[PDB]
Design a protein around this ligand. Structure first.
Ligand SMILES: Cc1cn([C@H]2C[C@H](O)[C@@H](COP(=O)(O)OP(=O)(O)OP(=O)(O)O)O2)c(=O)[nH]c1=O
Ligand SMILES: [Cl-]
Ligand SMILES: [Mg+2]
Ligand SMILES: [Mg+2]
Length: 698
DNA sequence: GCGCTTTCC
RNA sequence: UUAGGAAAGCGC
């Protein structure tokens, strides 16, 4: 193992910088591969550092209550358990082909495929090295990320040749197959049971650099491969999309006169560990992923092994015949791609009936391995779901974790309820289901009780178990309390009573003063109001936003007469209007009002006219021009008049040319309006809205 | 752009 | 001997 303190020494740094250069001159131009040369180099750098210098598992309990405190017996039991877990690779290759051919799967085009097979560059390697985390343990070879950062200039030309030889032969250095497994406890589980540990992998930094490059390449096309129902590990997606969608679906069932529904929360057992490698490679081929990229993935999964590090010892290696390492940057994407085969199958199987919410059919919400399935007529639909999952399990290794899976079941009588319960492997919850850190409730009326009441109590528990200045104590509230509170608001932005904030302010101020500060009321307002950004963007992926019992919620538009039983949108709207009132802003007809708006549609204008104006001139009424500027700001606008229906042109001129329209639309937009209209990304919305709310309410 | 924490898996 | 991925915030 490398001591990072040695890299700080001028004499060691110069002696090493020269030894690296002297190795690649003496040993290059020999009867050897770049793969074996790299491994020999690491072995030589290792010995040169030695010459220059010249977490406990105490008890394991079985299913019968017998324990062992013997280090050898604990090591044997643990090693035998993990060895068996990763031992059995499936051989039913024809059945894998059959399942994959059964459903319609996406496929990368030649442009996307060439982007994956694009040769690795030195600048690609450099950027990864620069972003490597510091103060972390090395992999089994002993080299920390700091070794690669310190000798970047000398190593990158060599790493590039190594990676170029890997992309030619599909052969890796032997060390690229090694990893250390560290066993970490799973929160709140019994730590005396061997199955309640999470096996975390520490791979060598050189292999992690290659894997991060491969992960970055496929992540560029992940939106094409994964349907928007999956938000776990996906860039630009939020877990609260699934939470709010699930809650509106529960409210729909609550309001339905005919109960014949089921909401199933399925967790996969040891999700990354049980992935079948031949099924994963076949799935990548099915999506068009082939060539150089595929060859490298295949080489990575050829003969990986693991050495468990337990109680001062490095245990004998075992092969990883199953799974993708927890700790490898490629693993989240390859897992999601495999699970996506099941997700496509569920959505495509009409005999697995989803919940119809008007024109929206809801059926699935995914967050990494967690699936929420929304079913109608579960006596048939849940049985077809379990059958499909069983067939996927046979080819992929997928397994339902029965102890972590639960369902809400809604029927009209006890007879159908018992008939359904008796045919399912997981339990029926009668009050709540923990999902993404929050409690989904069987009846949406219990949301405040099961989420915000426990939150106030757990914040008192954080301040009780917490030698610090009042300035440092304000930072503890900001670092640890604030994210828990914002997370809950984002998940369930329901109307909260003032009493919630009064008690939250009391618990917080007492902790700071021992019996800028975060304004929890303004963070709440920012989070609630933030939803209006999604209303304006009107994205196809935002199905969560189209699940309320409702008369559209639109900003920068003429409001409708107006639902009454809205959990989130009505409350968002009321906050939006109150903030606009405080800003002395007319928010109904503005420079950001769209051409496709109630303002234009109420003139009885044709949708073809709206489309013609959008495709030729832009998206807002301001783009087409108001007053003297009406369809005359550019030669393109003047000519576009000839493509518009004669009657609609007169209606539009009458509206756009009116004095009231001209004053409201041709004005200058405020900072507040720009936050909600001019940003194509939703990143940092709470920070930007909160910052504006401070400059208005303080 | 750098750094730090938190939520989820 | 705590890795990884996405997301959120705080901060100069
Ligand atoms: C919690 C967690 C998950 N993951 C990945 C790998 C996991 O297999 C996957 C799903 O996480 P989990 O569902 O939390 O765990 P699991 O599926 O491994 O095991 P269990 O049977 O207890 O459900 O997400 C990490 O890489 N690191 C983590 O810290
Ligand atoms: Cl027209
Ligand atoms: Mg997509
Ligand atoms: Mg799981």
């Amino acid at each position: 193992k490398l001591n990072n303190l040695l890299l700080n020494d001028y004499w060691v740094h110069n002696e090493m910088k020269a030894e690296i250069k002297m190795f690649f001159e003496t040993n290059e131009n020999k009867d050897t591969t770049y793969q074996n040369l790299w491994d020999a180099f690491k072995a030589v750098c290792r010995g040169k550092f030695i010459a220059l210098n010249a977490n406990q598992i105490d008890t394991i309990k079985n299913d019968k209550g017998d324990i062992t405190t013997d280090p050898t017996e604990i090591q044997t039991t643990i090693r035998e358990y993990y060895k068996h877990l990763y031992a059995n690779k499936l051989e039913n290759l024809e059945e894998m082909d059959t399942f994959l051919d059964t459903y319609t799967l996406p496929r990368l085009n030649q442009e996307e495929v060439e982007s994956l097979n694009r040769p690795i560059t030195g600048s690609e390697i450099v950027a990864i090295i620069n972003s490597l985390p510091t103060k972390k343990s090395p992999g089994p070879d002993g080299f920390t990320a700091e070794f690669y950062q310190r000798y970047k200039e000398e190593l990158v030309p060599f790493l590039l040749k190594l990676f170029q030889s890997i992309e030619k032969e599909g052969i890796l250095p032997n060390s690229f197959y090694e990893a250390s497994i560290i066993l970490i406890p799973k929160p709140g589980r019994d730590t005396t049971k061997k199955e309640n540990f999470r096996p975390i992998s520490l791979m060598n930094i050189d292999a992690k650099i290659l894997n991060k490059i491969l992960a970055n390449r496929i992540q560029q096309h992940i939106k094409k491969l994964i349907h928007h129902d999956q938000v776990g590990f996906i860039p630009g997606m939020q877990g609260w999309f699934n939470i709010r969608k699930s809650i509106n679906v529960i409210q729909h069932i609550n309001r339905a006169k005919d109960k014949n529904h089921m909401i199933i929360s399925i967790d996969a057992e040891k999700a990354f560990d049980k992935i079948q490698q031949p099924f994963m490679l076949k799935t990548l081929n099915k999506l068009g992923i082939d060539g150089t990229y595929f060859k490298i993935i295949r080489a990575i999964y050829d003969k990986p092994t693991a050495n468990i590090i337990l109680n001062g010892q490095k245990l004998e290696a075992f092969p990883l015949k199953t799974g993708t390492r927890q700790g490898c940057p490629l693993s989240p994407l390859l897992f999601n791609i495999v699970l996506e085969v099941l997700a496509r199958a569920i959505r495509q199987e009409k005999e697995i009936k989803g919940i119809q919410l008007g024109k929206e059919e809801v059926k699935l919400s995914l967050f990494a391995d967690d699936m929420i399935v929304y079913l109608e007529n579960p006596i048939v639909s849940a049985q077809n779901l379990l059958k499909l999952i069983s067939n996927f399990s046979k080819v992929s290794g997928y397994k339902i974790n029965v102890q972590k899976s639960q369902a809400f079941l809604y029927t009209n009588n006890r007879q159908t309820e018992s008939q359904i319960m008796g045919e399912l492997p997981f339990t029926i919850a009668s009050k709540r289901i923990k999902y993404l850190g929050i409690q989904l409730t069987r009846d949406v009326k219990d949301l405040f009780k099961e989420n915000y009441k426990p939150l106030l109590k757990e914040i008192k528990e954080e301040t009780n178990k917490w030698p610090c200045s009042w300035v440092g104590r304000i930072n503890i509230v900001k670092m640890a309390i604030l994210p828990k509170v914002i997370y809950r608001f984002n998940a369930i932005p329901i109307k909260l009573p003032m009493t919630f904030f009064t008690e939250l302010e009391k618990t917080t101020l007492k902790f700071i003063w021992n019996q800028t500060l975060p304004d929890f009321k303004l963070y709440y307002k920012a989070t609630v109001t933030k939803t209006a950004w999604y209303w304006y963007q009107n994205r196809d992926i935002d199905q969560w936003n189209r699940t309320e019992p409702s008369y559209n919620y639109l900003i920068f538009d003429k409001p409708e007469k107006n639902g009454k039983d809205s959990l989130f949108n009505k409350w968002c709207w009321e906050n939006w209007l109150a903030i606009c009132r405080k800003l002395k802003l007319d928010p109904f007809l503005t420079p950001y009002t769209k051409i496709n708006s109630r303002w234009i549609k109420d003139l009885n204008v044709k949708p073809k006219t709206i489309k013609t104006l959008e495709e030729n001139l832009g998206i807002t009424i301001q783009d087409i021009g108001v007053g003297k500027d009406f369809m005359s700001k550019t030669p393109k606008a003047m000519a576009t008049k000839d493509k518009i229906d004669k009657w609609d042109l007169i209606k539009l001129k009458s509206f756009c040319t009116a004095k009231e329209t001209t004053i409201r639309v041709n004005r200058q937009p405020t900072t507040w309006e720009k936050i909600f209209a001019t940003y194509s990304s939703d990143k940092g919305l709470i920070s930007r809205i909160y910052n504006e709310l401070k400059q208005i309410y303080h």
